[PDB]
Design an enzyme around this catalytic site. Structure first.
Site, PDB file in Angstrom:
ATOM      1  N   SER A  95     -11.684  10.216  -4.886  1.00 28.10           N
ATOM      2  CA  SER A  95     -11.307   9.988  -3.469  1.00 28.10           C
ATOM      3  C   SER A  95      -9.779   9.894  -3.412  1.00 28.10           C
ATOM      4  O   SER A  95      -9.143   9.784  -4.499  1.00 28.10           O
ATOM      5  CB  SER A  95     -11.980   8.754  -2.900  1.00 28.10           C
ATOM      6  OG  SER A  95     -11.472   7.554  -3.473  1.00 28.10           O
TER       7      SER A  95
ATOM      8  N   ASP B  49      -6.459   7.990  -1.005  1.00 22.26           N
ATOM      9  CA  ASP B  49      -5.966   6.968  -0.063  1.00 22.26           C
ATOM     10  C   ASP B  49      -4.822   7.584   0.737  1.00 22.26           C
ATOM     11  O   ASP B  49      -3.933   8.202   0.115  1.00 22.26           O
ATOM     12  CB  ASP B  49      -5.516   5.734  -0.839  1.00 22.26           C
ATOM     13  CG  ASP B  49      -6.626   4.817  -1.329  1.00 22.26           C
ATOM     14  OD1 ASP B  49      -7.847   5.139  -1.151  1.00 22.26           O
ATOM     15  OD2 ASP B  49      -6.257   3.750  -1.823  1.00 22.26           O
TER      16      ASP B  49
ATOM     17  N   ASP C  78     -12.006   7.726  -8.802  1.00 21.04           N
ATOM     18  CA  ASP C  78     -13.376   8.171  -8.416  1.00 21.04           C
ATOM     19  C   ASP C  78     -13.311   9.556  -7.741  1.00 21.04           C
ATOM     20  O   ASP C  78     -14.367  10.010  -7.292  1.00 21.04           O
ATOM     21  CB  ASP C  78     -14.058   7.108  -7.550  1.00 21.04           C
ATOM     22  CG  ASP C  78     -13.541   7.017  -6.121  1.00 21.04           C
ATOM     23  OD1 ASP C  78     -12.435   7.526  -5.850  1.00 21.04           O
ATOM     24  OD2 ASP C  78     -14.276   6.503  -5.275  1.00 21.04           O
TER      25      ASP C  78
ATOM     26  N   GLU D  27       0.858  -1.219   0.000  1.00 25.08           N
ATOM     27  CA  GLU D  27       0.000   0.000   0.000  1.00 25.08           C
ATOM     28  C   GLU D  27       0.886   1.258   0.000  1.00 25.08           C
ATOM     29  O   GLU D  27       0.570   2.174  -0.786  1.00 25.08           O
ATOM     30  CB  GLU D  27      -0.973  -0.014   1.183  1.00 25.08           C
ATOM     31  CG  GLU D  27      -2.052  -1.091   1.075  1.00 25.08           C
ATOM     32  CD  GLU D  27      -3.069  -0.927  -0.049  1.00 25.08           C
ATOM     33  OE1 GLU D  27      -2.971   0.076  -0.798  1.00 25.08           O
ATOM     34  OE2 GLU D  27      -3.942  -1.814  -0.195  1.00 25.08           O
TER      35      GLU D  27
ATOM     36  N   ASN E  22      -9.108   5.140   2.606  1.00 25.52           N
ATOM     37  CA  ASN E  22      -9.777   5.814   1.475  1.00 25.52           C
ATOM     38  C   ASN E  22     -10.756   6.861   2.024  1.00 25.52           C
ATOM     39  O   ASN E  22     -11.526   6.531   2.939  1.00 25.52           O
ATOM     40  CB  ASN E  22     -10.424   4.745   0.594  1.00 25.52           C
ATOM     41  CG  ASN E  22     -11.138   5.293  -0.618  1.00 25.52           C
ATOM     42  OD1 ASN E  22     -11.997   6.143  -0.483  1.00 25.52           O
ATOM     43  ND2 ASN E  22     -10.899   4.708  -1.778  1.00 25.52           N
TER      44      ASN E  22
ATOM     45  N   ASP F 289     -15.688  -4.732   8.587  1.00 28.71           N
ATOM     46  CA  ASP F 289     -16.841  -4.259   7.768  1.00 28.71           C
ATOM     47  C   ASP F 289     -17.534  -5.434   7.063  1.00 28.71           C
ATOM     48  O   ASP F 289     -18.680  -5.233   6.639  1.00 28.71           O
ATOM     49  CB  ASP F 289     -16.428  -3.196   6.744  1.00 28.71           C
ATOM     50  CG  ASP F 289     -17.569  -2.284   6.319  1.00 28.71           C
ATOM     51  OD1 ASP F 289     -18.346  -1.863   7.203  1.00 28.71           O
ATOM     52  OD2 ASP F 289     -17.687  -2.017   5.108  1.00 28.71           O
TER      53      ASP F 289
END
Ligand code: NA
Length: 129
Positions: free
Chosen positions: A50, A52, A48, A35, A59, A101
């Site tokens: 957004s 990170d 989109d 990452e 995000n 989640d």
């Protein structure tokens, strides 16, 4: 801050990520490597609109507020800039909510594509934990 592998392993463990939702420490270190390359300041814009943020590329679409992600949520209740800190407390706190989640660590596409099913224990090899 650019963390060492074992340095980051030690910090994630202290903050209770090791075997959190059943994910061994090596999974969390492996996710962080692909990452952020262990860089707390890492930021990456998504297609989109957004962004990170931090060692676990959390995000803005769902988790943190950056003021510029229209129609987004802030489910960790933090400014996204809190996720760039040399102290990973906030990143870990938020990652615990993400991995809870329902899709576990598949939420991190780079974990699914690069860590899932691999020898993740290699990532903590030689570390005094
Ligand atoms: Na947001």
């Amino acid at each position: 801050k650019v963390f060492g592998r074992c340095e980051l392993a030690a910090a994630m463990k202290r903050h209770g990520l090791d075997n959190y939702r059943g994910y061994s420490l090596g999974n969390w270190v492996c996710a962080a490597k692909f990452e952020s390359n262990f860089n707390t300041q890492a930021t990456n814009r998504n297609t989109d609109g957004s962004t990170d943020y931090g060692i676990l590329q959390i995000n803005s679409r769902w988790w943190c507020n950056d003021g510029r992600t229209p129609g987004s949520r802030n489910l960790c209740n933090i400014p996204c800039s809190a996720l760039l800190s040399s102290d990973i407390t906030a990143s870990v706190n938020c990652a615990k909510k993400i991995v809870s989640d329902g899709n576990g660590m598949n939420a991190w596409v780079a974990w699914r594509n690069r860590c899932k099913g691999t020898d993740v224990q290699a990532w903590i090899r030689g570390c005094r934990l």
